[PDB]
Amino acid sequence: PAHLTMPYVMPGDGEVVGVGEPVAIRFDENIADRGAAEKAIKITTNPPVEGAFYWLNNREVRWRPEHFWKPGTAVDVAVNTYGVDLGEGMFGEDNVQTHFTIGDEVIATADDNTKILTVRVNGEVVKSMPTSMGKDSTPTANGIYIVGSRYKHIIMDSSTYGVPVNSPNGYRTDVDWATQISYSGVFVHSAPWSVGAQGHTNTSHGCLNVSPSNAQWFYDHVKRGDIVEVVNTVGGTLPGIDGLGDWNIPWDQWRAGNAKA
């Protein structure tokens, strides 16, 4: 190693993901020549669709279409960096490939005006969940969120996101049925402690609090790549480079890319 870097591709080989899942190629070393890396990456889709690369940081690039994937689309990814100088004498340690498919269109919209999280599958409403989002002093950002990992039980610690547990906006909370939707720390999870406020008042630090029953349903039926869109909150907009906020970047900007950066 040292002059060799190993690329990692997401999603998993054979995985079925939602319509918002971007292709992600992560290197274990910073890429000096982003242009070279993009050239070494071949992506084939069926049905065919145009897409483009955009870097979230110095080690990870993302590729996605202008709009959400069409359900049933099959995607093949070939990261051929072996023999390729990714910049300053750094070569790919080996080549990697992955194949994944797009499942049904699942888009859950959380409207702060109604305090309801509505899950639509292929355009049809299948669930309407009262929710309680970030309180005014710690609001939930508006925007398009891509569903990530899920946990039957986990502890969310504010210090993971730069906020001391002992501070006013701090917390170290055990939660059931947690589905992560932003690297910034936003999750859709079971919140038995805010069932009264759900559908009426925002009381969280930013997460989308829902009933235990609804959180479990969300955990069982929503998958990586599905979409959660938050609208009308007093917060700002999820950053395009969050890690799960890719879609908040305007297509013209995304297509333009940032390889010469």
* 214 three-state secondary structure: helix
Among 67, 99, 153, 207, the active-site one is: 207
State how far the Cα of 256 lies from the Cα of 226, in Å rounded to an integer. Answer: 25
User: What token pair was written down for 90?
Assistant: 């750094």
Please enumerate in sequence order all residues whose Cβ is within 8 A of that of 127, keeping only pairs 6 or more positions apart, or say none.
118, 119, 214, 217
111 annotated as a binding-site residue: no
185 annotated as a binding-site residue: yes
CA angle 209, 214, 219 (to 5 degrees): 90
Q: Do you know the residue count of the chain?
A: 261
Please confirm, yes or no, whether 153 is among the known catalytic residues: no
Exposure string for 139-149, b = 16+ CB within 10 A, e = fewer? bbbbbbbbbbe
CA angle 250, 251, 256 (to 5 degrees): 105
Query: In terms of C-beta density within 10 A (0-12 exposed, 13-18 middle, 19 or more buried), how is residue 250 classed?
Result: exposed
DSSP state of 254: H
State how far the Cα of 125 lies from the Cα of 122, in Å rounded to an integer. Answer: 9
User: DSSP readout, 1-22?
Assistant: --SEE-EEEES-TT-EE-TTPP
Task: Give the fold, CATH level 3, of 1-104.
Answer: Immunoglobulin-like (2.60.40)
DSSP state of 32: S
State how far the Cα of 107 lies from the Cα of 69, in Å rounded to an integer. Answer: 12
171 annotated as a binding-site residue: yes
Task: Give the fold, CATH level 3, of 105-261.
Answer: L,D-transpeptidase catalytic domain-like (2.40.440)
Please confirm, yes or no, whether 205 is among the known catalytic residues: no
User: What token pair was written down for 32?
Assistant: 């000096």
- Start and end residues for every CATH 2.60.40.3710 domain found in the chain: 1-104
The CA distances from residue 254 to 64, 126, 144, 208, 247, in Å, are: 9, 32, 15, 28, 9
Q: Which of 212, 216, 172 is nearest to 191 (CA)?
A: 212
Among 3, 67, 189, 221, the active-site one is: 189
User: Which residues partner with 41 through β-bridges?
Assistant: 79
Torsion, Cα of 27, 31, 36, 38 (10° steps): 50
159 annotated as a binding-site residue: no
- Start and end residues for every CATH 2.40.440.10 domain found in the chain: 105-261
- Hunting for tokens 């002059």 — which residue is that? 3
